[PDB]
């Protein structure tokens, strides 16, 4: 789809995320060209699975604590596309339950920014 851009309305998509540690869930995610790597809420993973420690710099400062890194690839299905996005690794939000589609996923989408 062509997705308009409006400061008042977050550009969002429904995505089916498979962490390969539990059952795939459909979630609302932010479409974010400023994000190097996709961010999945920890709730989509099983309590036991191993995650990796990581340090993340973003607008609020630097955090050692808030995000982890996955140990398995993550599979993402977007409504219009039959072919699943395959992410070797992404970030995992242990706190604020953020779901954010970054440029790693948008690349495999063939997503572009267009400014006339």
Ligand X SMILES: CC(C)[C@@H](C)NC(=O)[C@H]1N(C(=O)[C@@H](O)[C@H](Cc2ccccc2)NC(=O)[C@@H](NC(=O)[C@@H](N)c2ccccc2)C(C)(C)C)CSC1(C)C
**Residue positions in the annotated binding site for Zn(2+)?**
65
The residues, ordered by sequence, that sit 6+ positions from 111 with a Cβ below 8 Å of its Cβ are: 31
Token look-up 């990581």 returns: 54
Token look-up 């869930």 returns: 25
18 catalytic residue (yes or no): no
User: How far is the C-alpha of 96 from the C-alpha of 4, rounded, in Å?
Assistant: 26
Partner in contact with 99, chosen from a copy of itself, ligand X, none, beta carbon below 5 to 8 Å by kind: none
Q: Which residue is nearest to ligand X (CB)?
A: 34
CB atoms within 10 A of CB 14: 11
Note whether 82 binds a copy of itself by CB under 8 A.
Answer: no
Identify whether the C-beta of residue 40 lies closer than 8 Å to the C-beta of residue 97: no
Note whether 102 binds ligand X by CB under 6 A.
Answer: yes
Instruction: Determine which residue in the list 5, 28, 36, 73 makes contact with ligand X, applying CB under 6 A.
Output: 36
Residues that bind ligand X (CB under 6 A): 30, 32, 34-37, 39, 56-59, 91, 98, 100, 102
Residues acting as catalytic residues: 32
């Amino acid at each position: 789809p062509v997705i308009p851009l409006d400061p008042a309305r977050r550009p969002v998509i429904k995505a089916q995320v498979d962490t390969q540690t539990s059952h795939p869930k459909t979630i609302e995610a932010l479409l974010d060209t400023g994000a190097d790597m996709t961010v999945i809420p920890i709730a989509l993973f099983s309590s036991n699975t191993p995650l990796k420690n990581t340090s993340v710099l973003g607008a609020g400062g630097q955090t050692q604590d808030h995000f982890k890194l996955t140990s398995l690839p993550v599979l993402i299905r977007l409504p219009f596309r039959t072919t699943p996005i395959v992410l070797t690794s992404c970030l995992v939000d242990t706190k604020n339950n953020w779901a954010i589609i970054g440029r790693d996923a948008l690349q495999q989408c063939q997503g572009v920014l267009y400014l006339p």
